[PDB]
Write an enzyme that holds these catalytic residues in place. Structure first.
Site, short mmCIF file in Angstrom:
data_model
loop_
_atom_site.label_atom_id
_atom_site.label_comp_id
_atom_site.label_asym_id
_atom_site.label_seq_id
_atom_site.Cartn_x
_atom_site.Cartn_y
_atom_site.Cartn_z
CB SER A 125 -1.18 -0.07 0.99
OG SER A 125 -0.93 0.56 2.23
CG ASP B 10 -5.55 -1.40 -4.53
OD1 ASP B 10 -5.82 -0.35 -3.89
OD2 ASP B 10 -4.83 -2.30 -4.07
CG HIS C 103 -8.45 -4.67 2.06
ND1 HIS C 103 -9.80 -4.91 2.09
CD2 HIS C 103 -7.93 -5.29 3.15
CE1 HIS C 103 -10.10 -5.64 3.16
NE2 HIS C 103 -8.98 -5.88 3.81
O1 LIG Z 1 -3.31 1.77 2.56
C1 LIG Z 1 -3.99 2.20 1.41
C2 LIG Z 1 -3.12 3.27 0.76
C3 LIG Z 1 -3.13 3.73 -0.56
N1 LIG Z 1 -2.20 4.65 -0.66
C4 LIG Z 1 -1.80 5.42 -1.80
C5 LIG Z 1 -0.45 5.56 -2.02
C6 LIG Z 1 -0.01 6.29 -3.09
C7 LIG Z 1 -0.91 6.88 -3.95
CL1 LIG Z 1 -0.25 7.79 -5.32
C8 LIG Z 1 -2.28 6.75 -3.74
C9 LIG Z 1 -3.31 7.39 -4.67
F1 LIG Z 1 -4.00 6.47 -5.37
F2 LIG Z 1 -4.22 8.13 -3.96
F3 LIG Z 1 -2.70 8.21 -5.56
C10 LIG Z 1 -2.70 6.00 -2.66
CL2 LIG Z 1 -4.43 5.80 -2.38
N2 LIG Z 1 -1.58 4.81 0.53
N3 LIG Z 1 -2.16 3.93 1.39
#
Ligand SMILES: OCc1cn(-c2ccc(Cl)c(C(F)(F)F)c2Cl)nn1
Ligand SMILES: *[C@@H]1O[C@H](CO)[C@@H](O)[C@H](O)[C@H]1NC(C)=O
EC number: 3.1.1.98
Length: 355
Positions: A146, A254, A300
């Site tokens: 993640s 995801d 997840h």
């Molecule tokens: O535990 C779930 C989670 C997801 N992320 C996350 C990390 C990097 C990026 Cl670039 C992104 C996004 F899609 F928003 F761009 C997310 Cl959702 N970090 N933790």
């Protein structure tokens, strides 16, 4: 259980609240393989949202309440039955306590209520492990799930550069990014970014980098330049700039991607087309990623879960694919490394996690 906590000896490298960061270690005396795993768990990008995370997710912002041991599970398990891939490796679990997708290089101070030091935590863990056996390593696999999967993409080449400058050019640094490969796509329904969970992926990262003083890999930074480094948090943009070998694990649907896209699961045509197009876009971004494992599941679930062995793509499990990747870094007959599902709907792969 098996992994023992070590707080960083350099107490200037801290979690969000200024408490020392650290790592959990289980050594394997005979082994020259080292697995350094970056925990995930979202992020926070302003005072108010970080304050809320401090109230109800404090272990992700502070070491004050960490247990003295953790049990290694999945790819961090030392039992070959649970971890066919690297059960005899030296195992390191690096807790995520910087809320910055492992990108930050900012201390808590009179100007900053919180420290965002994820990029420095990784560097300091590597430095302190060199005296505990990492100096003898042949392969350092930087893995993460993640936010930690994105952290692998942001930090794997910096670890390689660090080891080279410290005089260890023989350690082969590689990356394993699990569930950290996101699309900067349009939301299914617009939300106005105020909370982290449903904020559109593009604006979330733009705010975060400024608040965290976030750092990105140098070649990617040189492409996108000042003000645009948020682009480097997106796998399909940063991956082509990396020099270390990186294996990408990503569910096609995801759950965190769908969350930031404001999708919440009978499905009607508009949402059906949205979901199908998301999987097709993800598959497209992996076409030229030779080491990848991308099952057609809504999930997840991450690679440190004990049943990580159960999912297969085209009849090959992830531990097998990773073993084939190891062989490829010495195509192989019956030992594939590029495993991307082509079916277009969640759970069209029968081996998807049950939930
Ligand atoms: O535990 C779930 C989670 C997801 N992320 C996350 C990390 C990097 C990026 Cl670039 C992104 C996004 F899609 F928003 F761009 C997310 Cl959702 N970090 N933790
Ligand atoms: C402690 O960490 C900081 C930040 O990474 C670094 O500037 C400093 O040199 C480190 N000190 C020691 C003694 O390693």
């Amino acid at each position: 259980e098996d992994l023992r906590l070590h707080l960083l000896l350099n107490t200037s490298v801290t979690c969000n609240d200024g408490s020392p960061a650290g790592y959990y270690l289980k050594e394997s005396r005979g082994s020259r393989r080292w697995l350094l795993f970056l925990e995930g768990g979202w992020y926070c990008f302003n005072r108010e949202n970080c304050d809320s995370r401090y109230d109800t997710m404090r272990r992700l912002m502070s070491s004050r309440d960490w247990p003295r041991t953790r049990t290694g599970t999945g790819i961090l398990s030392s039992q070959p039955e649970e971890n066919p891939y690297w059960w005899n490796a030296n195992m390191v679990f690096i807790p995520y306590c910087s809320s910055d997708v492992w990108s930050g290089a900012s201390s808590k101070s009179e100007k900053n209520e919180y420290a965002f030091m994820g990029a420095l935590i990784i560097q300091e863990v590597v430095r302190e492990l060199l005296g505990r056996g990492l100096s003898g390593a042949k392969v350092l696999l930087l893995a993460g799930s993640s936010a930690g999967g994105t952290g692998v993409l942001l930090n794997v080449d910096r670890v390689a550069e660090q080891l080279e400058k410290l005089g260890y050019p023989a350690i082969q640094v590689r990356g394993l990014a699990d569930s950290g490969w996101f699309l900067d796509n349009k939301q299914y329904r617009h939300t106005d970014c105020v909370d982290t969970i449903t904020c559109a992926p593009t604006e979330a990262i733009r705010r975060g980098i400024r608040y965290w003083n976030g750092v990105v890999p140098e070649r990617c930074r040189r492409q996108f330049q000042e003000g645009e480094e948020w682009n480097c948090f997106f796998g399909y943009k940063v991956y082509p700039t990396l020099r270390s070998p990186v294996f990408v694990v990503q569910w096609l649907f995801d759950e965190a991607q769908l969350t930031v896209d404001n999708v919440h699961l009978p499905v009607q045509e508009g949402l059906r087309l949205y979901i199908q197009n998301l999987g097709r876009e993800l598959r497209h971004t992996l076409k030229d990623v030779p080491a990848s494992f991308a099952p057609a599941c809504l999930s997840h679930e991450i690679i440190i879960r004990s049943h990580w062995t159960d999912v297969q793509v085209k009849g090959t499990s992830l531990p097998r694919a990773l073993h084939c990747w190891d062989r490829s870094l010495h195509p192989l007959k019956g030992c594939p490394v590029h495993l991307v599902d082509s079916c277009p709907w969640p759970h069209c792969n029968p081996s998807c996690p049950t939930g």
